[PDB]
Amino acid sequence: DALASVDGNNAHVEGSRAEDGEMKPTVIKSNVTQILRKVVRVSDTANTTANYGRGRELMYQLEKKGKEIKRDLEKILLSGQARTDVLADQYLTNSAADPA
Amino acid sequence: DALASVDGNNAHVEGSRAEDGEMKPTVIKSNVTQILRKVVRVSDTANTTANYGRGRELMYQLEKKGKEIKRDLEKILLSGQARTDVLADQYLTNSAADPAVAGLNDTHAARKTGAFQFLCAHGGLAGGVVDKTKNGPADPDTGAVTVKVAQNASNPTTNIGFDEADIFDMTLQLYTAGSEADIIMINPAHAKIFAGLQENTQGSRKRIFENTKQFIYEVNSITDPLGQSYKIIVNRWMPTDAVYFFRSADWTQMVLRAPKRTELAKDGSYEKWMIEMEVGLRHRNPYASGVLFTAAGK
Amino acid sequence: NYGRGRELMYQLEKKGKEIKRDLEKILLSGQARTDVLADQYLTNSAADPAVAGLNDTHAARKTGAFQFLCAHGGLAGGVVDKTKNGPADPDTGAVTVKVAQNASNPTTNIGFDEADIFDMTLQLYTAGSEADIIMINPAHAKIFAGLQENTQGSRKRIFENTKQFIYEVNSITDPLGQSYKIIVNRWMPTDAVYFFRSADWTQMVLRAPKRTELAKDGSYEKWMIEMEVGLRHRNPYASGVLFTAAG
Amino acid sequence: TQMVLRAPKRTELAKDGSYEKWMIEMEVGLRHRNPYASGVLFTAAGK
Amino acid sequence: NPTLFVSYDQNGKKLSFANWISVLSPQDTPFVSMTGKESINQTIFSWQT
Amino acid sequence: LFVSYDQNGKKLSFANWISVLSPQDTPFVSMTGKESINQTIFSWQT
């Protein structure tokens, strides 16, 4: 909400009928969520053999991508992209979602 | 909400994968409220005197108005108005607001509720009232039509009524949908029909009297071929163009502003008062109650 | 979000009831016995040599409905025919599958027979059937109430200075002494009438309905319900079926 | 503020053999009190 | 910023969420209730007459 | 077939507050001073 514009000439008479005046409603701002997804497809064939050059490949890779999603989240939030959705003007009369 | 009508003859093979089904969402209904009002105005002089058969002219006139507002209520809830309102497609108002009619004032039109007829499976409108010359639609899942225009082909054009067989056709539609209606509200001018089940062209449960000193000629209870026992009730404030098949539990009175005391300005020997209350109407399902209109015969 | 909590358990319940609704409709629909096997019970050689090899490319199966298990006397495709009378019992002279003649109620309306219904009870009595129930769609129950007192004339159903109205018939007594009991069925077709007995029909269950969560492979959260059952009839001539035909 | 609908979680998927697949997903958004509460300044020219 | 407070000029309108859903789809199933259940172990069953 | 885009009774997640940046400083008035009077017209001399 925002207060009304300064009325620098709101001079009335000593005694007169008070007028209704003017008001302003609120302004609603809506946003939508985003889906961030990271998956892994490391096999187990090479995981069954005991190798000297590697300890694990599943939990280590999860942590790698477990950090990337955060390193990507920030890159997305600070981006200059535009909100993408097809549910406009469906909040106050949202009794039923967009049939189309 | 209602289940799906994809019953058909679903037949599946033994060694297949689960294929995506057919899912359908719910359906949201919405009704607006209406403002009732009753004003009172009595000069201070008349209110100061002592009438010869009552107290003050203010309270007496207020009580008379406090009762008229209830009568007006019973007549509106049972009317067939089409919920006159200016808004449209703004109930799920979550993505933005409605500034189309925001730069207005009391000049706004008068809001009206959705009466018994408008909330049922009405087939059309007549500007501000439901159209009785159109047969209502059918439910998606079932095939019931809770809004049927009486044929009256059995009875001649001389007497109008609605019908004698069309009463049993609605019970079929209600049972077809699954409604639990057990009350038949009717206008007193049409009670002669439910009691006067005769004039069926010499058949269909006509009449007899065993030369007894008691003459009743009344019908209060009814049972349909399916077993649905109905009880007929009369309402003086009901219109004389339709019959209602409903249940008490399937209706509710939505009250927003209850009637309260309102002392207004005087402006000189006026002593003005006012009564006001905002109320709405609800219906659990448009297909949970029947509306049998009235039409001529052949 | 607000107001809309979940749609998974709610949909499961909806589907849990729909599967049962279909069963009551399929058994009374009148479909035909569908299968890829045939005459594989007396060769005493093997289950089937020519059907083996196909894992899931087979076609769906269908259970013999109320009409198929009776003396239908012909098929009109995937569903039993509602026009050709059933074959006459060789032993007796009974015909349990008939078609309404529609003597009265001129062709202006379809007009299910409303008369000559005692013939079917005769066909049943002639076949030794112990039928005691008449399952019918509610769309034709009025025809049984009018059987009480219409008789296109003067039969004079009486009031006797009473306010209660009934106009409902749920029991009938055949001229041969067979007392039947009328029952309404919302899922029955509007062009058939089933004279039968409960004990003469059994529900063959192989896989009772059970919920089973499937693989996710993403955010699908897939679920399913499955049940495998059949229908049995002791003797075709132990029950009857009366269709409706105007002209 | 950071509006979150689905918090981070390591989900396991089907096993169609030796695949051994896994998943990490989350659903969030972004909220700002007033558009004129923060400022943006673009720096760019022709090329 | 309404000067004359009314219902159509309010940026709010906190909707009234009913706590129920209406359903009429019946599941009488009179036939299935009177038939009786018999468990089998084969996709095909046979009887003699 | 149920998906988030098909829901109807969505209980909105509305914020329980309102933001407004309209300043209310009024520096001048906070330095002038006030002197009560009992007339609609005042005068002084120079």
Residue numbers in the entry:
A (entry chain BN): 52 to 151
B (entry chain AK): 52 to 349
C (entry chain AW): 102 to 348
D (entry chain BN): 303 to 349
E (entry chain AW): 3 to 51
F (entry chain BK): 6 to 51
Quote the study that presented this structure, word for word.
Escherichia coli phage SU10 belongs to the genus Kuravirus from the class Caudoviricetes of phages with short non-contractile tails. Here we show that the virion of SU10 has a prolate head, containing genome and ejection proteins, and a tail, which is formed of portal, adaptor, nozzle, and tail needle proteins and decorated with long and short fibers. In contrast to other short-tailed phages, the tails of Kuraviruses elongate upon cell attachment. After binding to the host, SU10 tail, nozzle proteins, and short fibers re-arrange to form a nozzle that extends the tail.
The prolate capsid of SU10 is organized with fivefold symmetry and is built from 715 copies of the major capsid protein organized with the triangulation parameters Tend = 4, Tmid = 20. The major capsid protein forms capsomers of two types: pentamers and hexamers. The closure of the caps is enabled by pentamers, which are bent in contrast to the flatter hexamers. However, the formation of the prolate SU10 head also requires variation in the shape of hexamers and in the angles at which they interact. The major capsid protein of SU10 has an HK97 fold, which is common among tailed bacteriophages and herpesviruses. According to the convention, the capsid protein can be divided into the N-terminal arm, peripheral domain, extended loop, axial domain, and glycine-rich loop. The major difference between the capsid proteins forming hexamers and pentamers is in the structure of the annular loop positioned at the tip of the axial domain. The capsid of the genome release intermediate of SU10 is identical to that of the virion.
